[PDB]
């Protein structure tokens, strides 16, 4: 029942993504990471949301908006408003 409201794009080819991924996990933020490395249809979509690039730690919220390389603070403050929980 842990609702992961964040769709985070990840790969095994990682570095900078892991930084944010560690931050969000330590911040008790539930996220769902994508299969794009193996799952091609979603990989192409990364290129779409970044705009010709495929930046790893791209997060798409339940809001539909994507944040390419966000700060953990932003994510957490956006999470609390879009989920309407853990806000207070």
Question: In words, what does this structure look like?
Answer:
A hairpin with a 4-residue loop joins strand 3 (58-61) and strand 4 (66-68). The chain has helices spanning 16-26, 40-50, 72-83, and strands at 6-8, 31-33, 58-61, 66-68. The protein has three helices and four strands, in the order E-H-E-H-E-E-H. 39% of the residues lie in helices and 15% in strands. By secondary structure, the protein is of the alpha+beta class. It has one domain (1-88): Glutaredoxin (3-Layer(aba) Sandwich), CATH 3.40.30.10. A four-stranded mixed β-sheet has the order 2-1-3-4, sandwiched between helices.
Descriptive terms for the model:
monomer; 88 residues; alpha+beta; Glutaredoxin; Grx-like_ET; oxidoreductase activity; Putative glutaredoxin MT3292; electron transfer activity
């Amino acid at each position: 029942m842990v609702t992961a409201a964040l769709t985070i794009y990840t790969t095994s080819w990682c570095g900078y993504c892991l930084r944010l991924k560690t931050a969000l996990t330590a911040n008790r933020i539930a996220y769902d990471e994508v299969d794009i490395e193996h799952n091609r249809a979603a990989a192409e979509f990364v290129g779409s949301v970044n705009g010709g690039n495929r930046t790893v730690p791209t997060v798409k919220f339940a809001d539909g908006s994507t944040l390419t390389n966000p700060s953990a603070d932003e994510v957490k403050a956006k999470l609390v408003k879009i989920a309407g929980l853990e806000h207070h």
